[PDB]
């Protein structure tokens, strides 16, 4: 099975997809994030952040409260399973994580924690 996915976030506060599936037989999984557009990070920064569905609200609320110099994530937030950096237009960042962190029967969400973006920039992550 493939073990990576390419995700884009644009100047329109959109991701290219709202559903990612991770095949069990992957030991690691990589998300490659890019930002088409022209807007810089402080105004249209995007990141890809993974937690359980239950934790998504907290991560987003705490991240937004943390500010740009924290890339909009609360320091030491243990609800965050994996994430990319916050990137502005033209930049790119990849994260690779251990698939063993993810458990059967759990609901996962990926999302962006830049202020307001999770309204649109979120999706499900499913183990298969
Ligand atoms: Cu494979
Ligand atoms: Cu964003």
């Amino acid at each position: 099975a493939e073990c990576s996915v390419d995700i884009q976030g644009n100047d329109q506060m959109q991701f290219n997809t709202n559903a990612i599936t991770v095949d069990k037989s992957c030991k690691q999984f990589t998300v490659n994030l890019s930002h088409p557009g022209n807007l810089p990070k402080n105004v249209m920064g995007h990141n890809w952040v993974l937690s359980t569905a239950a934790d998504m609200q907290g991560v987003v609320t705490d991240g937004m409260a943390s500010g740009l110099d924290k890339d909009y994530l609360k320091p030491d937030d243990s609800r965050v399973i994996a994430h990319t950096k916050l990137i502005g237009s033209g930049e790119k960042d990849s994260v690779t994580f251990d698939v063993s962190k993810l458990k059967e029967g759990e609901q996962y969400m990926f999302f962006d924690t830049f202020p307001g973006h999770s309204a649109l920039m979120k999706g499900t992550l499913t183990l298969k």
Side-chain angles (χ1 to χ4, degrees):
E2 275 193 75
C3 302
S4 64
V5 65
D6 294 342
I7 297 287
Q8 306 177 347
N10 65 22
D11 279 351
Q12 284 66 67
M13 203 183 90
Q14 301 155 347
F15 279 137
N16 66 315
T17 174
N18 68 16
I20 297 180
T21 72
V22 175
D23 182 294
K24 294 217 170 75
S25 58
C26 291
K27 292 296 271 41
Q28 291 173 309
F29 188 78
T30 294
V31 176
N32 300 122
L33 183 66
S34 58
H35 191 319
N38 309 113
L39 288 177
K41 187 173 87 152
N42 66 315
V43 155
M44 202 38 72
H46 301 315
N47 50 6
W48 181 93
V49 184
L50 184 56
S51 69
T52 60
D55 286 335
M56 174 181 159
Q57 187 187 326
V59 164
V60 171
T61 298
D62 295 347
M64 301 187 162
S66 302
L68 173 69
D69 290 336
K70 293 179 168 89
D71 268 12
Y72 299 105
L73 276 184
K74 188 177 80 93
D76 309 289
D77 185 336
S78 68
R79 292 173 288 195
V80 174
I81 298 171
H83 62 107
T84 67
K85 299 175 191 185
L86 184 82
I87 70 171
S89 110
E91 308 186 304
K92 77 190 19 178
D93 185 57
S94 288
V95 59
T96 297
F97 58 89
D98 281 337
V99 166
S100 82
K101 297 212 200 290
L102 298 189
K103 45 227 207 6
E104 302 175 323
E106 182 61 82
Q107 239 134 122
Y108 296 96
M109 285 306 279
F110 72 81
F111 47 89
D112 178 321
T113 61
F114 185 91
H117 291 197
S118 82
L120 298 191
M121 291 183 80
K122 64 177 177 204
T124 55
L125 182 139
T126 63
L127 220 52
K128 126 216 199 72

